[PDB]
Every structure is written in C-alpha cells, then in structure tokens.
C-alpha cells in the first residue's frame, strides 16, 4: 500500500545518488588524472 508516488521518489534517488558516487570516483578514483 506504500504510496505509489513515494515508490518513485525513493528510487529516483537511487540512481540520482549512485551516479553521484560514480561521478565522484572520477575525481579521485583509480581512473583519476593523478
């Protein structure tokens, strides 16, 4: 019964947040320029 809406916002953060880690690991990762 969880609000079909909240099912879409909590998740739309999953990508929105994971891709954010992804985008960081590109500024210090193994694939950095340093």
């Amino acid at each position: 019964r969880i609000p079909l809406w909240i099912v879409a916002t909590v998740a739309g953060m999953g990508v929105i947040v994971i891709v954010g880690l992804f985008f960081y690991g590109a500024y210090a990762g193994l694939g950095s320029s340093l």
Binding site: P3, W5, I6, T9, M13
Partner: peptide, 28 residues
C-alpha cells in the same frame, strides 16, 4: 568532514513537505 548530510536534509525537506501535506490531506 562531509556535509553530504546537509544536501540530503535539504533534499528530504521538500519531497516530504508533500508527504505531510498528503498525509494531512491538503488540496495539492
């Protein structure tokens, strides 16, 4: 060290202003 807290707070703020507004019911 990480204000990663602040951003998530500010985040959860307005997407849950709607929650309360939907759980209190209020012509959204």
């Amino acid at each position: 060290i990480a204000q990663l807290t602040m951003i998530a707070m500010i985040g959860i703020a307005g997407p849950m202003i709607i929650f309360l507004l939907a759980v209190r019911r209020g012509n959204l």
